[PDB]
């Protein structure tokens, strides 16, 4: 996402994301996660059950929120230049 923004001209904020998230937030996340004892099987839930609810909520949110976005964001056979 940082590169996507730099690529479209938003260098300061794209560099700000780099300095702030990758630089400092994810580092604090790495500290805590490499010191808390984590048994990787107690965090594992039966994901296969939630496929139908993934199917349902994916359609409903996508179908509604997309109409809300403005024309300029969804701007991307005669193609407009």
């Amino acid at each position: 996402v940082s590169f996507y923004l730099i690529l479209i001209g938003l260098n300061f904020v794209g560099l700000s994301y780099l300095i702030v998230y990758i630089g400092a937030v994810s580092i604090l996340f790495l500290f805590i996660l490499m010191l808390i004892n984590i048994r990787t099987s107690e965090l594992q839930s039966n994901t296969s059950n939630s496929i139908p609810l993934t199917i349902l909520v994916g359609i409903i949110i996508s179908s509604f929120l997309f109409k809300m976005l403005p024309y300029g964001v969804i701007i991307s056979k005669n193609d407009l230049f």
Binding site: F12, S16, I19, V20, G23, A24, V25, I27, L28, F31, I32, L35, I36
Partner: protein
């Protein structure tokens, strides 16, 4: 084994101050237009984030610092 809390404090105090200095870099590349009014606002912003820095200095949150006469006094009174 328990992990030391100072690891958390290193990341947190960095995370906040690093966000704070980031908010000042626009001021340094906009000084001529900002002039006196911009300076005053930035001084106020610098002052607020400084007071929170003297709080961790005052409490050793970084836990970097913090690294005899006898009370028993006898008196002689003599024979009974």
């Amino acid at each position: 084994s328990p992990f030391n809390i100072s690891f958390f404090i290193y990341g947190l105090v960095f995370l906040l101050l690093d966000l704070e200095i980031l908010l000042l870099y626009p001021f340094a590349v906009s000084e001529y237009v900002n002039s006196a009014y911009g300076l005053a606002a930035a001084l106020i912003f610098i002052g607020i984030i400084t007071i929170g820095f003297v709080y961790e200095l005052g409490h050793d949150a970084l836990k970097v610092h913090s690294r005899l006469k006898s009370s028993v006094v006898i008196s002689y009174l003599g024979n009974i």
